[PDB]
Design a protein around this ligand. Structure first.
Ligand SMILES: Cc1cn([C@H]2C[C@H](OP(=O)(O)O)[C@@H](COP(=O)(O)O)O2)c(=O)[nH]c1=O
Ligand SMILES: [Ca+2]
Length: 129
């Protein structure tokens, strides 16, 4: 896989962000994770974590997997990076997302994320507390 440029338009919630990609606005849903909804426990903390991470970044990048690049809602499906740090992994490592929605052929970073989740579980962080 490879990273491509994107520029933040707006933080949305823990696992969705609006970014401009090849000059067009899109809403991206982060691959391989599930944050709580804003109305659910930790939902606001996940939203604020992702928002801080993308708003503070000097450089956002998007990385598509090998499979489907959009979902049925027309959202982009990608791994997102903020100054080189994967947002999807960072959420999981902080116990603010579960590994979820692991579909065959768009699961290149699964094992990296499962290892973050195990570590967040060991530390009993947030969702795992
Ligand atoms: C992350 C992800 C979500 N989705 C779809 C499955 C879920 O469908 P349903 O809407 O029918 O439940 C929905 C969950 O997204 P949210 O967790 O953003 O609600 O997005 C994909 O199809 N592919 C993906 O890789
Ligand atoms: Ca969600």
């Amino acid at each position: 896989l490879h990273k491509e440029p994107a520029t933040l338009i707006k933080a949305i919630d823990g696992d969705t962000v609006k970014t401009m990609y090849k000059g067009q606005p899109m809403t991206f849903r982060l691959l391989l994770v599930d944050t709580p909804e804003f109305n659910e426990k930790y939902g606001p903390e996940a939203s604020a974590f992702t928002k801080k991470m993308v708003e503070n970044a000097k450089k956002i990048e998007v990385e598509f997997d090998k499979g489907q690049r959009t979902d049925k809602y027309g959202r982009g499906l990608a791994y997102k990076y903020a100054d080189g740090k994967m947002v999807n992994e960072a959420l999981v490592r902080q116990g603010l997302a579960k590994v979820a929605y692991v579909y065959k052929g768009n699961n290149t970073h699964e094992q990296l994320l499962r290892k973050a989740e195990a570590q967040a579980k060991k530390e009993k962080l947030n969702i795992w507390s």
